[PDB]
Design a protein around this ligand. Structure first.
Ligand SMILES: CC(=O)/C=C/c1ccc(O)cc1
Lengths: 9, 272
């Protein structure tokens, strides 16, 4: 399963 | 400014600006050098001297006195179009997002030690009148040698207050359902929600929610084996009604939180 970062905003 | 620090490689860039590795020539202290363009700065403030600065500088100075689990502001400079911040740099270091990506779901003993240290650091911010508003694994650095966690990036923060907040520029997948539904939240209770997301992230290997509907659905499915005591703490932090969430004291008094490892012990058992 794809784990990803999440940008602010 | 340009002759007090020897600039090195780019460590990262994004919504926060561009952060470089560097070394203070005065004593070879490892530092991080963060650049923020003036035109990209949303919230401005002023500190004692009455000089107008980005709010991030105001918040960093308020939390940067003495020792803590917050990365400290050592110095800062104004340029024609930008502000430059000199920050502590642990060495060796890895951020908590990469750590979890590589190791997977963390043993509960290790998640307890990490989460405890995050709690002490956020308590410290709130004692100093600062609300971080962007607690997540990406904004947490691990000093691999000392086993200490360090909070970074106050660029979405605010002064702590007891009235409602109606603005938010943190990470949406860590924001609480009252923000998704109504664009309103209170500081401490919204922080606790993001801490629930962080604890789930540590013990399951990834955050529980990706979509608005999941955030406001308030159903927590556990994708890894997690103890009943830990599941209970997580579900409590992720209560849909803010007033149903625990205080920071209730979190640290929870049975899952007892007998935390020391930082040194944590590094020796789990990091070295
Ligand atoms: C994004 C931010 O405000 C600070 C980043 C950062 C600080 C210290 C370090 O060692 C590496 C990165």
């Amino acid at each position: 399963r794809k784990r990803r970062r999440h940008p602010s905003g | 400014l340009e002759s007090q620090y020897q600039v090195g490689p780019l460590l990262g860039s994004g919504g926060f600006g561009s952060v470089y590795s560097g070394i203070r020539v005065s004593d070879n202290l490892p530092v991080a050098i963060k650049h923020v363009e003036k035109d990209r700065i949303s919230d401005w403030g002023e500190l004692p001297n009455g000089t107008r600065v980005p709010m991030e500088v105001v918040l960093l100075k308020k939390v940067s006195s003495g020792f803590s689990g917050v990365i400290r502001l050592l110095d800062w400079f104004e340029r024609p179009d930008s502000f430059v911040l000199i920050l502590e740099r642990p060495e060796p270091v890895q951020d908590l997002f990469d750590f979890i990506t590589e190791r997977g779901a963390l043993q509960e003993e290790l998640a307890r030690s990490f989460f405890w240290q995050v709690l002490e650091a956020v308590r410290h911010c709130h004692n100093c009148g600062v609300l971080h508003r962007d607690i997540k694994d990406e904004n947490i650095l691990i000093d691999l040698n000392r086993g200490e966690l360090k909070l970074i990036d106050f660029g979405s923060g605010a002064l702590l207050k007891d009235t409602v907040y109606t603005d938010f520029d943190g990470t949406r997948v860590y924001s609480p359902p009252e923000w998704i539904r109504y664009h309103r939240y209170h500081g401490r209770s919204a922080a606790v929600w993001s801490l629930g997301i962080l604890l789930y992230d540590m013990v399951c290997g990834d955050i529980p929610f990706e979509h608005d509907e999941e955030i406001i659905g308030g159903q927590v499915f556990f994708r890894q084996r997690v103890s009943s005591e830990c599941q209970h703490l997580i579900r409590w932090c992720l209560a849909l009604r803010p007033s149903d969430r625990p205080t920071f004291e209730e979190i640290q008094n929870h049975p899952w939180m007892q007998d935390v490892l020391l930082p040194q012990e944590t590094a020796e058992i789990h990091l070295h």
